[PDB]
Design a binder for this molecule. Structure first.
Ligand SMILES: Oc1c(Br)cccc1Br
Ligand SMILES: Oc1c(Br)cccc1Br
Ligand code: SF4
Ligand code: SF4
Ligand code: SF4
Ligand code: SF4
Lengths: 419, 443
């Protein structure tokens, strides 16, 4: 697999084509959060927050012995087990995605963490860096990234175009039990300050925050191929908790090396753009980053840092030309959210960032299918050529973290392929 | 013949019954007696002769090594930056672990109820933790819970009936009103008792496990071979540390699954009871001279955690692949141990010191001597694990009829940082050994 990645390396430079209209995108505009898309009816006709309507459908399916919309389970017990696995997978994730910056798991400084307090006498986070050489730092941090659970890791200079103009967060002293009802919008700004810092008014990223480290966290193929049913939800959920652990582990390593580090999971900025600029894969018709190793069946998280690093090269292995003629995701999408048309610079709705050349999809149509189906769909990921019943999945092949030993050698790494 | 870990486990499976041999002086063991916590062993001199809590003296040695550009005792690093990087990696690995081991029950990550967790609150409208179980068949439950366990990061998983002999008589914990920054100064003992109650509960005086708590699920969390082979130096400390955080994630993930199936679940990591005994009874491996559970897949180079539950399950069979007989003649760990903590003598039922639980046949090691080497070396040693022939990846051969151990196996850090790695430090050359189908999970 290291052969292929070297073979398809592009020359340096962001491969995302932009025009003079591009502006940073306010996070509240996503379909998950925006007032125009947030409320959806449940199966009884009651309008609720979309995830509560989705909950009602999960309950209905368990009672009716179903693993998904009009997909009968082996019995009620199997139906229950799939939703229990899904719910458990989210254990280390806040309110579906860890998006609030500098809250809960996503702290922008390590100072208050229990691990930092226990290690304080050693003073690793107070000691100036002993290594400033970006080549050695790139090798160290990528090794750490693999220890921390990334199946793929890449480095890019930070393109501020993909950092949200304003984040969705909560006030700092609001308890978890009130968080969903007290979400607010808060600017993310870049200033000449020593350290990432949050004021009452602003999330402040230092101008020295040069780089972004992007991690790919592989989902399980057997489970994703049950999309839109419950086991696809379960591999989604478990990987969100893997994302969170990656961010915390890697931020701590970077801090203990003498630099600062900002975790993010689904917050702070647009993961797909970062992942493309860092060479993990290419943008696709469905909108996901398609990787050679996993196709789009891989989750993304990222960490921002002033640690000196060597940027990776973007890769071109023909995804754009293949998506131009394929359209399989668009034809299988249960909500017709994915376009069959050509790429443009103009978003279809508020949910798209205009000003960048991409396939423009209707993400409110996507979200509408989630309460209907009682899950997170994923049919587009499941049918994509690059990616390649529920009783058979439960009785079938599994391995640690859902990884597959038939392909796990493809992500082996030596220094030569780290820097 | 291509290595078949499932065939190996089938070949060496025993008939039912705890393999640990006990006599009449066996009593449950108070957790405060471990070398980490007992006042006789807790204090150790640093390299300047100052007597401190052992981990503070070890800190002093880590700092000295970085300043002198060393990766371990008398082991020069490539440069100061490499020495720094190894300790940064080690420190980061512990991110999801409280005070080296997560031992306080029902505190921090080790909650005995899911009710207050952010995930439970988010999911409350579905009622999964309040709805009665839809599955009570132990066969289906074993398949379900083991699949979840592999999703949750276990490289090995097994089930045993809970043997209360290995549950600590009293736990080490902190009062519920004590904040983290004072925890190390406010540790206390608290009895673990079994009573006729519906759910695990803590009172001001007792940690109460229900009499319905029939089963224990044991997970093996594989460490990285290349890094452990640097024991007693910093990279062995880093694979130890990262696996403690994997243990914590496993416990929380699995307890939440079990609760959402309609049962209760008690996490534990290094607390609550003795992991090696549970692992032996659950068939992960056999006890050894060094004292660890040796597994066919990883030897002793694997961490353990466990979850206690009333979920009906099918116990696994113990395994006997000849470890006792190899340990009888090997003694490599005993010869290489830098503190001479491991005995070269026979097994007995009589503890060597307060740190051993008497009344069970085992090799009796001096664990105060072991702990004494940790401040001296500035780490968690591991030389015994590193030199054990079972830690080697290629011990198994097939003779055309059956699997056997190759007797011939019993006769630097820069290169690790520049060398092979993969996700979670797992090794794709051997990762096929832990593939699992339904037949591997429940018979
Ligand atoms: O990424 C997600 C977010 Br942010 C919210 C709900 C579900 C998913 Br998947
Ligand atoms: O298992 C451990 C405990 Br409990 C404490 C310190 C170091 C280790 Br390793
Ligand atoms: S997740 Fe489902 S509804 Fe959404 S774009 Fe993909 S196929 Fe369509
Ligand atoms: S299904 Fe086809 S068009 Fe859609 S993302 Fe995959 S390759 Fe592209
Ligand atoms: S080194 Fe030898 S005696 Fe020690 S635990 Fe391993 S096999 Fe047994
Ligand atoms: S960890 Fe080190 S000091 Fe302790 S028993 Fe093993 S070899 Fe000896």
């Amino acid at each position: 697999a290291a052969e292929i990645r070297q073979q398809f390396a592009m020359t340096a430079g962001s491969p995302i084509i932009v025009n003079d209209k591009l502006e940073r995108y306010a996070e509240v505009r996503t379909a998950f959060t925006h007032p125009t898309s947030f409320f959806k009816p449940n199966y009884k006709g009651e309008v609720k927050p979309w995830f509560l309507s989705a909950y009602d459908e999960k309950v209905r399916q368990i009672e009716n012995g179903e693993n998904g919309p009009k997909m009968k389970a082996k019995n009620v017990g199997e139906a229950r087990a799939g939703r229990a696995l899904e719910a458990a997978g989210w254990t280390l994730d806040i309110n579906y995605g860890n998006i609030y910056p500098n809250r809960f798991f996503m702290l922008w400084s390590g100072e208050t963490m229990t691990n930092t307090q226990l290690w304080a006498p050693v003073g690793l986070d107070r000691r100036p860096p002993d290594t400033t050489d970006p080549v050695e730092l790139t090798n160290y941090v990528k090794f750490a990234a693999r220890m921390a659970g990334a199946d793929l890791v890449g480095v890019a200079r930070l393109n501020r175009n993909w950092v949200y103009s304003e984040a969705v967060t909560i006030p700092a002293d609001v308890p978890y039990e009130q968080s969903l009802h007290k979400e607010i919008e808060k600017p993310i700004v870049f200033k000449d300050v020593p350290l990432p810092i949050e004021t009452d008014d602003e999330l402040i990223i230092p101008n020295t925050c040069e780089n972004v480290i992007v991690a790919g966290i592989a989902m399980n193929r057997e489970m994703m191929q049950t999309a839109p049913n419950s086991m696809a939800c379960a591999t989604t959920a478990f990987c969100y908790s893997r994302m969170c652990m990656f961010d915390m582990w890697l931020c701590q390593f970077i801090r203990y090396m003498g630099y600062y580090a900002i975790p993010s999971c689904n917050g702070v900025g647009q993961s797909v753009a970062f992942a493309v600029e860092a060479g993990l894969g290419q943008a696709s018709r469905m909108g996901a980053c398609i990787t050679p190793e996993f196709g789009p069946n891989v989750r993304l998280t990222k960490v921002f840092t002033n640690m000196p690093l060597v940027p990776d090269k973007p890769i071109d292995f023909g995804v754009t030309e293949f998506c131009e003629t394929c359209k399989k995701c668009a034809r299988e999408c249960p909500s017709k959210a994915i376009t069959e048309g050509p790429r443009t610079f103009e978003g279809r709705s508020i949910h798209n960032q205009s000003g960048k050349l991409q396939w423009q999809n209707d993400y409110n149509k996507c979200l509408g299918y989630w309460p209907e189906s009682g899950g997170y769909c994923g049919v587009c990921v499941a049918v994509c050529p690059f990616t390649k019943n529920i009783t058979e999945v439960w009785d079938g092949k599994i391995n640690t973290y859902g990884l597959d030993a038939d392909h796990f050698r493809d992500t082996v790494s030596f220094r030569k392929d780290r820097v």
